[PDB]
Design a protein around this nucleic acid. Structure first.
Ligand SMILES: Nc1ncnc2c1ncn2[C@@H]1O[C@H](COP(=O)(O)CP(=O)(O)OP(=O)(O)O)[C@@H](O)[C@H]1O
Ligand SMILES: [Mg+2]
Ligand SMILES: [Zn+2]
Ligand SMILES: [Zn+2]
Ligand SMILES: [Zn+2]
Lengths: 84, 521, 168, 97, 229, 51, 58, 171, 107
RNA sequence: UAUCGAGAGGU
DNA sequence: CACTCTACCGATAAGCAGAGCTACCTCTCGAT
DNA sequence: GCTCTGCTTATCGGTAGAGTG
């Protein structure tokens, strides 16, 4: 009902600075609780570092639910949002 | 995690429905009736049942669990009582609104003095907002000085024909003057709270709506007080001046005054009542119930403590810079904070802050134990709270903290994955740094810690400008984020380098200054 | 823990004592009103199930779940083992044996025949099918709600129901 | 004592868009409190024994529709102070329009 | 739709100058040989003169620049101010392309004229502030970027690209790609608390500062005073 | 004491002894009891007659 | 400003407060609908399915 | 009395469960948690319909905890008894204080004061039963009773019956 | 449209809403000596059709109460005879974008 | 490890 | 058909009372 | 102790209409 179909999405295809900070922090927390990591972990083992590696490879398994003023929303995966 | 488990689902608040507490509801939520003004049993220790500190109201003592909910003082929210009033009194906040409703309805049967047959009045009922509707209605009915029995054959609207009073406010009293039929003699009688209460209960549900009130939540007779909700001791705690000397809160004394004054209204109407005394004793109950809620009533003396200072009523608890909202809710004092004198350092990066060792050993960050940091964190635990880099607490998955000051076998602690170690503040931890007055967002920026000797916070000279800082005694404040999520907000949104250009004037707010600027020329 | 579609019921000034559940007076409480709502907000009549209906749904659902777990490849004691946990094995086994020994219309052919015969409150429709009866006198006693509805055929209903009822 | 994170520091965090940090400062780092409310009447009138696992709003005769909230202690205080003045501030966990 | 940190003062070059100086900088005449593009700056110089179909493009370019000049001079900036904060610093993008691609010389460009006019015209359709095909969205999007398009067209005109900046095909495609990327980066981000930022940006200077001025005048405005001094 | 409000505060003060100069100044101080509510400026200015 | 008068009027007129403002959520100790709070974060079940099968919950 | 009820369950998932079989885990978890349990509000949840196709939705990450909250909506067959409701049953035990009768999920107690007077408990008989002349209530006897009281433990519900009325008794 | 010279008595002013669905509008003859819509600072207001308004509300997913407002007594609203619920579109100079379309709905 | 005030100060 | 004579709603001020008055930080001292 | 605004009371006509010669 409230959900907006993928083909009719009008919001920005770039990850916002606010979405990035929340995604990195949220994913960091989940990693420190031993969530399955989707990238190889080499020498950089801090939760934030692993989360930043997953971000750079479009591998953070989270979805942004962007609410519009009327209450409807577009779900965007972090795999599909453009990272600078 | 510091909260003991509860099976009730955790949710956030999405809506606040305001309204008035009906007399029935006040009694339905109460856990004890408050009757006796003597706080103590008989100065023989323990609180008097039915008294203002009845233990059913809740526990504020470290060794007594609440006799209503069984929880310790930490969990117990406090529970309300109720106090029946011998005579109905006005709510001090609502007198001017009561006056408006009186001028709207017939003071005999309780009918809206105008009907939907009146075109302008029919327009006023159309207004969706309750507050605006009430005003549009009151602007019409104020001048209608007779309850019409007939619609404007004879079609009757249910009126009773009585003339309406001209209502005037005189302090906590409402006076109504009826004009007996040209000019003759008018007789102003007092509109007691009880009289108005009964008239208000006869307002129809349909007329309740047209007046902007609400049949379930804001019924107009609930503006008259017949039963008072007695707040628990959490709202009005006692304090001990010298260990063995304890005084009561201003609210506790004021409720005692209401209870005493209530008993004397019961003592008159049943025996020695010289009338001019019944009016003086009832007026005094109105006084205590009014100044208990609002002690800045214009035009009359303030209620005073025996010390001479005015009583701290509930209204004064909430208003002003120091009140409940601006002083406790929009801002408040916080843990994991620090403050000291600032100094400049030519040998620090722009985004660093030099933090005295003593501060870095007092502040802490709770790092979750994983396979990748368990060895590192055990080393901190062995060093303990007084040696840097060290640690202050070990937090179990259950929430139990292990205090590393008092653990003599700290070397025999084994950390489990998922535990937390509250380690000392350490190099490159992000922290929020701040100089007052906080005029714009770069008055609060995230810096990377560098732990350093001596007792000042160190700043790169080029961050002095956005902080408007210098080193003539200025002090600055540091705040430590406590989670992976709040660390990331600091490093990814608030960090100094992200702030070099400000949206204020699409230009930098930091540059080369002082020695470096003189020298570079 | 587990909750349903019916929500709200915020506090009102006036209480109510038309609430005590009495199956004789058709007072089934706040959860089993005549008009229910599904998980999309659409209005829907209450789904009351006779013993015979319920036997079909429960048995179908249990063997359909077993087939789905087998990628797409009979007895009640075996059919109840599809559930997860000894508490569920218990309630389901006790429910099937009860339905196995009191469901008159033990196949969907007869069941749809009873469905069309009956299609009047949804609670009564399930009672008439579950409780075998001889005469109208026994039906208006055990189901005192059929009193003031004034539209029988009841007897040929019971006669057809009893005729449709297979031997045992 | 702790430093005062005042209204102007609040405004700075709003400008930063640091919602998580501001929430944390004003809850976990200060007066975070858990209360139980009644799902029907919205008041903090619930009697909750946690070792007995029993909850009840006696006014509504309700033992099942009950929620816990995390709010500032000073918010619990504010709401109890409003109740003491006959104002009902009902905290609901669902909208209605 | 822009973030305050992302704009810089830039000159919109179709605004100043006389009509003669304007025409001298922007007009290309493929008929009059001495008013055409210099032959030593392009390789295809021979196949240029006389081409009426290529002159139709250069006319549509110059007519657009005249519209811009008329729009900017009669509606937006009547007093002639042509230096204004705008996103994406074009001077830096060009001088980086001149350095990255070694656009020194005295070397003829391999960049054809239709590539310039269509490249730039297609660029101004990819500067998405608002997305969606709705008629109102497309209108809002065109209004939102009108001024910036004028800035771009005033710089990336055929004559200037070839005579003045001396871009080749590799550099010109890079400038287009960079402009598109930097414009996206200059959009304000949803979630931005522009209210408090507005409040602090106006309030902070006031704390450090015959008609009434300064704080007493600010107070007259904000309070909507009925009797000003 | 019973009239602590409406009475003027700060008429008597603890004698400053931080250093000798501060004691001398404290014994020679004067106070204008106007307030802090109602800003104005006129009584705060250095008037010519202060010479 | 006018803190107590606002709240008295709100009771007497049964005002419904939808808690969408920044100040509401700050005083309720809730993540405010601003910046990092202007959206929700969901778990991407589709992207998790690219993990090997031995990562599966038991 | 059987119904189809539209229910839902809030499931919170720890991040270590954020793996490739997450949705299937939640569907199994719903069944393990809901099937066979009893509540006074809905009754016994007997079986869940279409368990392998339940739509678990998307998990909302809880701010500050990392864990995800799913609302698993489903439809089940539920059984709740009612005061006044007549039902059939199978007696499980007979004792001097009456008999116990299995009505599906739960067990109903009928006391001696709610048994007609001519039905007399006979321990010497084999097997023991409440007997009359043309009546016989031993273990395994189909009986038709009326639920006259429902008591709720939120774990198992307790119902007391009666055959002290018309058309009720052995069948 | 009734142009008066000095005043309209409040009693006669009540004869104005008693005459629907016909609409009476009053103007003081003084107030019309200069046409205010010719001023530099007053951009061109254009009333939206009933269809155009609906198109606007859907594009922004707006309730009517969420548009910026113009008072019924606004000089330009009176000039256009705007009634409650009607929307004007206003195309306006902008120093950041050149052109900007503002919408207001009449109270 | 009190509360209510007052006074003097720091940037 | 020319007069007043009073019941209306404007539009007046008109007087009034209260509401508000930067941020954070230090220390001493007296009364309850 | 000082500025502001809004809200609650008197004065001002102003008509606008029956009673009038
Ligand atoms: N009473 C006060 N209220 C609020 N902020 C104050 C204040 N007194 C000082 N400040 C803060 O401290 C700053 C004053 O700095 P000072 O050291 O007092 C003067 P300056 O203008 O920096 O240097 P100068 O001594 O070279 O003239 C103010 O700009 C403000 O940041
Ligand atoms: Mg300084
Ligand atoms: Zn308690
Ligand atoms: Zn009346
Ligand atoms: Zn309740």
């Amino acid at each position: 009902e409230l959900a907006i179909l993928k083909e009719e999405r009008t919001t920005t295809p770039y990850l916002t600075k606010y979405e990035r900070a929340r995604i990195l922090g949220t994913r960091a927390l989940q990693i420190s609780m031993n969530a399955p990591v989707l990238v190889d972990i080499e020498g950089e083992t801090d939760p934030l570092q692993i989360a930043m590696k997953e971000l750079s490879q479009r591998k953070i398994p989270l979805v942004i639910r962007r609410y519009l003023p009327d209450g409807s929303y577009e779900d965007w995966g972090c795999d599909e949002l453009i990272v600078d | 995690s510091q909260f003991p488990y509860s099976s009730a689902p955790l949710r956030s608040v999405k809506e606040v429905q305001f309204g008035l507490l009906s007399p029935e509801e006040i009694r339905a939520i109460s856990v004890v009736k408050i009757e006796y003004p003597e706080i103590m049993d008989e100065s023989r220790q323990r609180p008097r049942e039915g008294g203002l500190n009845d233990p059913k109201l809740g526990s504020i003592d470290r060794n007594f669990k609440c006799q209503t909910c069984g929880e310790g003082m930490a969990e117990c929210p406090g529970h309300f009582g109720h106090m029946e009033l011998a005579k109905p009194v006005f709510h001090i906040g609502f007198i001017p609104k009561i006056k408006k409703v009186c001028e709207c309805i017939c003071m005999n049967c309780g009918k809206l003095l105008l009907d939907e047959t009146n075109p302008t009045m029919a327009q006023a009922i159309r207004i969706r907002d309750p507050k605006k509707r009430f005003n549009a209605v009151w602007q019409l009915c104020k001048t209608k000085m007779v309850c019409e029995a007939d619609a404007p054959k004879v079609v009757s609207r249910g009126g009773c024909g009585n003339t309406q009073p001209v209502v005037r406010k005189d302090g906590m009293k409402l006076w109504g003057t009826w004009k007996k039929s040209r000019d003759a003699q008018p007789e102003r009688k007092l509109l007691t709270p009880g009289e108005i209460l009964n008239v208000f209960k006869h307002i129809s549900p349909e007329d309740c709506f047209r007046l902007g009130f609400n049949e379930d939540y804001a019924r107009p007779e609930w503006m008259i007080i017949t039963v008072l909700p007695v707040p628990p001791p959490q709202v009005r705690p006692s304090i001990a001046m010298d260990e063995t000397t304890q005084g009561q809160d201003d609210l506790t004394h004021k409720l005692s005054d209401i209870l005493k004054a209530n008993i004397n209204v019961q003592k008159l109407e049943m025996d020695g009542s010289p009338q001019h005394i019944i009016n003086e004793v009832e007026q005094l109950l109105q006084f205590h119930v009014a100044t208990y809620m609002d002690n800045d009533i214009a035009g009359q003396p303030q209620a005073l403590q025996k010390s001479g200072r005015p009583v701290k009523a509930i209204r004064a608890r909430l208003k002003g810079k120091e009140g409940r909202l601006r002083g406790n809710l929009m801002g408040k004092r916080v843990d994991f904070s620090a403050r000291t004198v600032i100094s400049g350092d030519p040998n620090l990066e722009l985004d660093q802050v030099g933090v005295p060792i003593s501060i870095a050993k007092t502040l802490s960050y709770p790092e979750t134990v994983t396979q990748y940091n368990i060895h590192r964190l055990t080393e901190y635990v062995r060093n303990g709270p007084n040696e840097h880099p060290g640690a202050k607490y070990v937090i179990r998955d259950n929430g139990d903290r292990i205090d590393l000051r008092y653990h003599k076998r700290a070397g025999d602690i084994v950390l489990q994955y998922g535990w937390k170690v509250e380690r000392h503040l350490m190099d490159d931890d992000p922290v929020l740094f701040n100089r007052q007055p906080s005029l714009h967002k770069m008055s609060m920026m995230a810096h990377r810690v560098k732990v350093m000797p001596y007792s000042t916070f160190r700043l790169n000279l080029s961050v002095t400008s956005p902080y408007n800082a210098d080193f003539d005694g200025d002090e600055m404040n540091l705040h430590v984020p406590q989670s992976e999520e709040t660390r990331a907000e600091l490093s990814q949104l608030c960090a100094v380098p992200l702030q070099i250009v400000s949206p204020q004037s699409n230009k930098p707010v930091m540059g080369i200054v002082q020695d470096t600027l003189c020298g570079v020329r | 823990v587990s909750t349903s579609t019916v929500g709200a019921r915020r506090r009102r000034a006036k209480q109510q004592v038309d609430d005590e559940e009495n199956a004789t007076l058709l007072r089934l409480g706040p959860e089993f009103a005549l008009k229910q709502y599904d998980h999309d907000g659409n209005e829907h009549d209450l789904i009351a199930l006779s013993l015979s209906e319920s036997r079909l749904l429960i048995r179908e659902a249990l063997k359909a779940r077993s087939r789905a777990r087998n990628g797409g490849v009979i007895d009640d004691d075996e059919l109840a083992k599809v559930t997860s946990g000894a508490v569920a094995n218990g309630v389901v086994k006790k429910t099937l044996d009860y339905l196995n020994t009191f469901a008159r219309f033990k196949d969907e052919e007869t069941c749809t025949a009873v469905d069309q015969l009956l299609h009047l409150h949804p609670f009564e429709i399930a009672q008439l099918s579950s409780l075998g009866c001889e005469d109208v006198d026994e039906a208006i006693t055990l189901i005192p709600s059929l009193a003031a509805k004034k539209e029988v055929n009841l007897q040929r209903i019971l006669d057809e129901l009893n005729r449709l009822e297979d031997p045992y | 004592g702790g430093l005062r994170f005042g209204e102007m520091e609040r405004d700075c965090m709003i400008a930063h868009g640091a919602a998580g940090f501001l929430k944390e400062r004003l809850m976990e780092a200060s007066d975070a409190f858990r209360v139980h409310v009644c799902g029907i009447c919205g008041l903090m009138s619930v009697i909750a024994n946690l070792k007995k696992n029993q909850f009840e709003c006696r006014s509504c005769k309700n033992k099942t529709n009950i929620y816990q909230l995390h709010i500032p202690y000073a918010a619990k205080l504010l709401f109890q102070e409003l109740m003491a003045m006959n104002i009902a501030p009902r905290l609901y966990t669902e909208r209605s329009g | 739709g822009l973030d305050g940190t992302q704009v810089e003062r830039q000159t919109i070059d179709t605004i100043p100058g006389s009509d003669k100086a304007f025409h001298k900088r922007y007009y290309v005449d493929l008929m009059d040989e001495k008013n055409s593009i210099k032959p030593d700056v392009i390789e295809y110089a021979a196949d240029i003169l006389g081409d009426v179909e290529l002159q139709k493009e250069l006319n549509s370019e110059y007519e657009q620049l005249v519209s811009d000049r008329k729009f900017l001079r009669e509606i937006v900036f009547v007093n002639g101010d042509h230096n204004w904060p705008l996103p994406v610093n074009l001077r830096r993008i060009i001088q980086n392309a001149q350095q990255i691609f070694h656009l020194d010389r005295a070397k003829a460009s391999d960049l054809t004229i239709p590539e310039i006019i269509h490249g730039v015209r297609d660029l101004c359709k990819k500067l998405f502030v608002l997305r969606g095909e709705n008629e109102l969205i497309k209108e809002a999007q065109q209004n939102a970027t009108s001024l910036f398009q004028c800035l771009v067209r005033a710089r990336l005109a055929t004559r200037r690209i070839l005579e003045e900046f001396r871009l080749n095909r590799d550099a010109f495609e890079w400038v287009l790609g960079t402009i598109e990327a930097q414009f996206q980066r200059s959009l304000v981000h949803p979630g931005e608390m522009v209210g408090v930022i507005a409040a602090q940006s106006i309030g902070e200077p006031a704390t450090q500062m015959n008609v009434t001025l300064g704080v007493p005048r600010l107070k007259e405005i904000l309070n909507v005073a009925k009797n000003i001094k | 004491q019973k009239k602590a409000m409406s009475s003027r505060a700060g008429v008597s003060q603890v004698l400053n002894r931080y250093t000798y100069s501060s004691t001398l100044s404290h014994l020679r101080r004067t106070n204008t009891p106007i307030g802090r509510d109602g800003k104005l400026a006129k009584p705060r200015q250095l008037h010519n007659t202060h010479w | 400003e006018e803190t107590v008068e606002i709240l008295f009027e709100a009771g007497a007129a049964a005002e419904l407060d939808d808690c969408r403002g920044v100040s509401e959520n700050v005083m309720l100790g809730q993540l405010a609908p601003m910046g990092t709070g202007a959206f929700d974060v969901m778990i991407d079940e589709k992207l998790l399915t690219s993990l090997p099968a031995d990562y599966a919950p038991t | 009395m059987f119904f189809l009820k539209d229910l839902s369950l809030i499931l919170t998932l720890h991040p270590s469960y954020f793996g490739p079989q997450m949705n299937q885990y939640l569907r199994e978890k719903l069944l393990t948690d809901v099937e066979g349990t009893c509540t006074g509000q809905f009754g016994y949840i007997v079986t869940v319909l279409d368990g392998m196709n339940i739509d678990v939705g998307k998990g909302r990450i809880i701010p500050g905890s990392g864990s995800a909250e799913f609302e698993v909506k489903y439809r089940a067959v539920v059984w709740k008894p009612f005061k006044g409701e007549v039902v059939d049953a199978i007696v499980s035990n007979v004792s001097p204080i009456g008999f116990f009768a299995d009505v599906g999920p739960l067990n109903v107690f009928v006391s001696t004061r709610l048994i007609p007077d001519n039905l007399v408990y006979n321990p010497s008989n084999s097997p023991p039963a409440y007997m009359s002349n043309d009546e016989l209530i031993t273990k395994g006897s189909k009986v038709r009773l009326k639920v006259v009281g429902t008591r709720t433990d939120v774990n198992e519900i307790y119902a007391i019956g009666s055959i002290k009325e018309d058309f009720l008794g052995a069948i | 449209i009734f142009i008066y010279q000095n005043n309209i008595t409040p009693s006669a002013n009540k004869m104005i809403p008693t005459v629907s669905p016909a609409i009476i509008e009053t103007f003081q003859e003084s107030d019309l000596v200069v046409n205010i819509t010719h001023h530099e600072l007053v951009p061109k207001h254009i009333r939206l059709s009933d269809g155009e308004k609906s198109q606007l509300l859907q594009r922004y997913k707006l309730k009517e109460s969420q548009l910026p407002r113009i008072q019924r007594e606004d000089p330009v609203a009176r000039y256009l005879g705007l009634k409650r619920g009607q929307v004007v579109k206003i195309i306006r100079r902008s120093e950041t974008s050149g052109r900007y379309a503002s919408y207001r709905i009449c109270l």
